[PDB]
Ligand binder design. Structure first.
Ligand SMILES: Nc1ccn([C@H]2C[C@H](O)[C@@H](COP(=O)(O)OP(=O)(O)OP(=O)(O)O)O2)c(=O)n1
Ligand SMILES: [Mg+2]
Ligand SMILES: [Mg+2]
Ligand SMILES: [Mg+2]
Ligand SMILES: [Mg+2]
Length: 435
DNA sequence: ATCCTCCCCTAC
DNA sequence: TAAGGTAGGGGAGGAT
């Protein structure tokens, strides 16, 4: 049953989990705006970024001292690095497409399970988060596989924020294992050097989780995030003002928060690889080429300038639910049955968050023409494109029968081969809170 | 100029 | 096998 299929997918999805945890930690921090750790150590803006090292791995091997110091990966694959042969799939074509259009603008039995997190040992060999386990185990035959433990990560994630909250409420939740903290007040009250405090928080986090955090310190958010890169693993790095200009010039532009593979490829065609190359670009040229806001962001960031305060309050703008894995329909009756289920799921989330929406958007992934019907990854969406529809209701609703019905009307206007469908997503906008 | 609407992109 | 989600920023381009 599609009802059990949905529940079962979300049950096993790490990406669904990290998103929920982020949502929860964000709400916890918001709450704090409506300190045992400071007094227990009471015995020019300053920003600290706290980021746990190889978070799933570290938690996974907490109580497994045989795996410390080894190449380890958190993945679904039991450990062989093999999967059943998939004849008619074309891993080569999908990988080329991934390197060409996506990373820019025996193979047949290898595991295509993703590595969620890998140890630093494993990294010293090119294994990175998001690599297929089959391939990783080719780069490093001694890669150790470790199962997910979602309960344990949620517990460490919470312990992490509780700990930071014990020093200050001036926190921004970046993710489940990562927060920004403004420590200007603490340093003034305790009279401690930024480094002394950073060490203290690290010692305490390790004490309470058996997991290591790296800390980056700087006079703004951008600079604190970048210092963390240099701090990892198990360390800290204070990027002082006198070092900013020389540190920044050598950084690959891709390291700037907000520059991914698409922006990188567009900059490389401008002849720009490092932040230093970028500094030579005018504000007017960056805005013309990239738009006003992105243009300005690039100009400022490549200089180490950033004036965003720590955002302690975040308001929810949308609720959604997508599954782009294990979607295979043959009949329009099956697809419409599934749309009505995801509609009950979207009702639960709107309720759980106490919202109703006016604007409803259906997004379908469809197999791309020329792309093989048999996916390289078991259950994968493979190479696809997106069809999207949007409607707007007269009243904000949270009723699945109305949402379901809206999804069926939207789905009918699509020109679609059911057997090419590879993913479905419902997105709710223009929210209003209940009561 | 500001405001819509339909997307692409990015972070984790 | 394997579980490729989720929210928000913002550009293009068009109507107001
Ligand atoms: N491709 C990815 C990236 C991240 N996450 C999960 C696994 C990570 O353990 C956790 C935190 O991600 P980070 O980006 O902080 O990376 P790590 O903590 O694993 O390593 P690092 O030490 O580089 O921060 O989120 C995931 O499921 N899949
Ligand atoms: Mg981390
Ligand atoms: Mg996996
Ligand atoms: Mg992280
Ligand atoms: Mg970047």
């Amino acid at each position: 049953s599609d009802c059990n299929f949905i529940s079962n997918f979300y049950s096993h999805s790490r990406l669904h989990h990290i998103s929920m945890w982020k949502c929860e930690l964000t709400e916890f921090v918001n709450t704090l705006q409506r300190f045992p750790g400071r007094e227990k150590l009471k015995k020019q803006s300053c920003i600290m970024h706290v980021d746990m090292d190889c978070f799933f791995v570290s938690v996974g091997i907490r109580n497994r001292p045989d795996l410390k110091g080894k190449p380890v990966a958190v993945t679904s694959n039991r450990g062989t690095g093999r999967a059943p042969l998939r004849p008619g799939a074309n891993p080569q074509l999908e990988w080329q497409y991934y390197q060409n259009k996506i990373l820019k603008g025996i193979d047949s039995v290898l595991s295509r399970a993703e590595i969620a997190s890998c140890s630093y040992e494993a990294r010293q060999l090119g294994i990175k988060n998001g690599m297929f386990f089959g391939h990783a185990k080719q780069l490093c035959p001694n890669l150790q596989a470790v199962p997910y433990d979602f309960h344990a990560y949620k517990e460490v994630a919470q312990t992490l924020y509780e700990t930071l909250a014990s020093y200050t409420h001036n926190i921004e939740a970046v993710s489940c294992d990562e927060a920004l903290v403004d420590i200007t007040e603490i340093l003034a009250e305790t009279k401690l050097t930024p480094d002394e405090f950073a060490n203290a928080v690290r010692m305490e986090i390790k004490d309470q989780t058996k997991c290591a955090a790296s800390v980056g310190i700087g006079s703004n958010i951008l600079l604190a995030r970048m210092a963390t890169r240099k701090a990892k693993p198990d360390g800290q790095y204070h990027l002082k003002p006198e070092e900013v200009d020389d540190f920044i010039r050598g950084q690959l532009v891709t390291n700037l928060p907000g520059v991914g593979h698409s922006m990188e490829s567009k900059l490389a065609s401008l002849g720009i690889k490092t932040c230093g190359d970028l500094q030579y670009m005018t504000m007017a040229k960056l805005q013309k080429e990239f738009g006003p806001k992105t243009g300005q962001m690039l100009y400022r960031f490549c200089r180490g300038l950033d004036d965003r305060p720590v955002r302690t309050e975040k308001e929810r703008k949308s609720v959604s639910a997508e599954i782009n894995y294990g979607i295979r329909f043959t009949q329009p009756k099956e697809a419409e049955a599934f749309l009505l289920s995801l509609s009950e799921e979207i009702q639960r989330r709107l309720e759980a968050t106490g919202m109703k929406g006016k604007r409803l958007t259906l997004k379908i992934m469809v197999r791309k023409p020329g792309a093989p019907v048999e996916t390289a990854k078991f259950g994968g969406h493979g190479i696809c494109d997106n069809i999207a529809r949007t409607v707007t209701l007269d009243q904000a609703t949270d009723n699945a029968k109305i949402i379901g019905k809206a999804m069926l009307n939207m789905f009918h206007t699509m020109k679609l081969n059911i057997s090419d469908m590879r993913g479905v997503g419902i997105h709710v906008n223009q929210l209003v809170p209940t009561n």
